């Protein structure tokens, strides 16, 4: 089985200072890798990988692997510039990390909108 | 600006001659539009919109809109060249259908891989 | 194939607070363009075009162009003032957008909204 | 196309097999009265739904297009640092129809096959 999404991240609107969590759950054989990506504008030139501890540890990534892969992306103390398009990426392609990055992966996107308190 | 995927399409392996169905389920206020897109290689240069009747009518699309958007993409009599990356796209942005824009900019995407194997 | 309605929108009665969805399905070769128009009274002077996002984003238009043109018009949080004649217009005439609107066909539906009293 | 077009191929792109990391160059040379326009198109699978126009700078500048119009039209398509995903059908399209940009184009196709380092 090529990687497939069983749970996808879900768009959400938030207030600055709040926090959000996005979830990802993927199946396949071999077990797929999960990565979280982001772009201000939903276009390939804008997408970059996020990681546990990004943005001075406002960003947290907890990922676990078994038969399936599961992950939560969490961002606290939200700012306006956290708005944009977030993405769970999954692949069990053996060449998936060989240095256009989306070519061997699948993607499932969510929109995050952060509004200013009043 | 608020559409989200409740259920995204699921990757699958099929044999030549069979059929597949992909399913896409989305929430948003107002109700988001749904589209289906495809590419042999998962890069924006190769993605094109599929539609009801495509590929000599082997492709059907059935979509229903209420509070949610729900759609099924079905392709019958599968061939090797039906393999690739398929994609549900959703949006309720009022400018989602303007032409002066990289098609993905006002949409969100949820992808599945379809592999079609030769009966032999 | 000249643009032709395979399914035309159907008149409905609603109560305030509800939503309605009208449906328009047109065949043709090439595939016809679809527009939605509205008027309080069925007179030419009162018809104007509905756009996605109108009426404080209570108006949605989701149109798909395949073999057929298939469109749904949805309006939420219905008020008494949303009552009227709603119309799907279709055309695959090459100069349909370039000679007034004589190149489009119309199919109408009445939406009557009553107070949830 | 027989009524409002008369351009014709004098040099056509040539199929070729290459290794990942290498570069290729395809050539097109077209005659007619008036001078015909040249475009380069590509598809993974030789079918109309997959064909898209390429341009100078495509694929993160790996794709180069150099076209000159004198009496005839001549053009070179170059792709460097080749990947497996550069494989497929490339074609030169040409037309000297007035309405050509509003089919009244003609095409000459080549197959590119990229193999990895064994």
Residue numbers in the entry:
A (entry chain A): 29 to 127, 130 to 148
B (entry chain B): 29 to 148
C (entry chain D): 29 to 126, 130 to 148
D (entry chain C): 25 to 126, 133 to 148
The authors write:
Plasma membrane Ca2+-ATPases (PMCAs) have a crucial role in this process by extruding Ca2+ against a steep concentration gradient from the cytosol to the extracellular space. Native PMCAs form heterodimeric assemblies with the small transmembrane proteins neuroplastin (NPTN) and basigin (BASI). Here we present the structures of mouse PMCA2 in the presence and absence of its accessory subunit neuroplastin in eight different stages of its transport cycle. The structures revealed an overall classical P-type ATPase architecture with ten transmembrane helices characteristic of the P2 subgroup.
NPTN was clearly resolved in all NPTN–PMCA2 structures, including the immunoglobulin-like domains Ig2 and Ig3. The most N-terminal Ig1 domain, however, was highly flexible and consequently less resolved. We therefore determined its structure by X-ray crystallography and fitted the resulting 2 Å structure into the density of the E1-Ca state. The resulting combined atomic model of NPTN represents, to our knowledge, the first complete structure of NPTN. The Ig2 and Ig1 domains of NPTN do not interact directly with PMCA2, but Ig2 appears rigidly tethered to Ig3 by means of two hydrogen bonds.
